[PDB]
Design a protein around this nucleic acid. Sequence first.
DNA 1: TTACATACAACCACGTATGTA
DNA 2: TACATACGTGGTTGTATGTAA
Lengths: 202, 201
Amino acid sequence: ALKTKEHLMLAALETFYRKGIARTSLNEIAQAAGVTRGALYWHFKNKEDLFDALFQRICDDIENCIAQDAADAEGGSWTVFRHTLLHFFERLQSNDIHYKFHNILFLKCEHTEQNAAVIAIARKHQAIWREKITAVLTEAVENQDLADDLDKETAVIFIKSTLDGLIWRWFSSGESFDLGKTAPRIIGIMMDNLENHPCLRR
Amino acid sequence: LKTKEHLMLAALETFYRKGIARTSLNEIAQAAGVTRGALYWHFKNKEDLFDALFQRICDDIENCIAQDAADAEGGSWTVFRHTLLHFFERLQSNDIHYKFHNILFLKCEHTEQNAAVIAIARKHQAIWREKITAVLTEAVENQDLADDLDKETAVIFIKSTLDGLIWRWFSSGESFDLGKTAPRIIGIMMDNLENHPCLRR
DNA sequence: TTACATACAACCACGTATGTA
DNA sequence: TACATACGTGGTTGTATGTAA
Ligand SMILES: [Ca+2]
Ligand SMILES: [Ca+2]
Ligand SMILES: [Ca+2]
Ligand SMILES: [Ca+2]
Ligand SMILES: [Ca+2]
Ligand SMILES: [Ca+2]
Ligand SMILES: [Ca+2]
Ligand SMILES: [Ca+2]
């Protein structure tokens, strides 16, 4: 019977991805899941609770692969950081669930205060990235991989901005360019800038 | 036109503070000084109001980008740096341009059924593709950038760099000083186009 | 005729109550 | 329980109508 709930959340993701969330009625999710609105209201209080339960689960799974890809990675924290970033963008192509998650967060939702769950998922995703980037940066200067006078506060903004822009451009372009070729270049330039550009120094 | 200008600016603020989908034309009307009869007179529906409001603003954005470059303070690539710097100063000081980008980033759904949103996004992107491409060709015909620069990747690299700064600044709730951050991130971006070998072919 | 305000009719989505197995 | 169906409601929309420029 729990298959019905997982069907609903995946039907929610698919419908959220093709119509945006606001234009998605609970009836449309139910029809896409081959069920009725009674099924949804049974498992979920409303559309907000369905979006939150769906995007809390996916956001946790994203945090897990970034953690799992790093723990199974040999080398220094700064070497596996490139490793974790490349796999993140590979999942954007190959992992449909993670792909739709990010695409919905960037393009097909309104980040405004009345959409409480959207603002909550966005901050959760950003706090995850802030946590990973911050810890990687401290470890990378404790190993001379980056200079000990690195402007690390500016570095987190620089890193997250660079990656958000690639994700945004890729989505907003309608995937007009090859993420598999572009992301390695943009990440390498980003990491080269953190090693050698003087403006990322204090 | 005084009523029509009130409506579009009231639409701009209401679109900004509540998002577009959650914005009834009733709320726009009472956020303005009028009723829905005023809106349906000047506009066919919410999409026609959003398009007229956002075609006019996006044109004004394209005009300041052009006006500050036509006030050529130096070479084509030297002027390009300042067109970008003036663009991010406008995002702080110009409340209309600020909302426009804020509404066209975190306050709207880029989905096919919202025809005018997709159309304005395409326009705004085509604006930047034209400016960036023309700047890049003039900058290699002046040796400011190398003759083997990956021009196709350069536009993606430039627009991604700028969209990410705008996205991050908005998404963080303006957590950081863009007056200080954008010059740094622009300069690193422009230094990368001069000297990074991966922006070469 | 314009330039609106008000009135009217309709639907769409929602939440809940209820049937049911 | 785990749904499907039925019911009642409001919010938004679009249009019709009124009315003073
Ligand atoms: Ca719909
Ligand atoms: Ca509303
Ligand atoms: Ca007002
Ligand atoms: Ca201002
Ligand atoms: Ca009147
Ligand atoms: Ca209700
Ligand atoms: Ca009855
Ligand atoms: Ca209607």
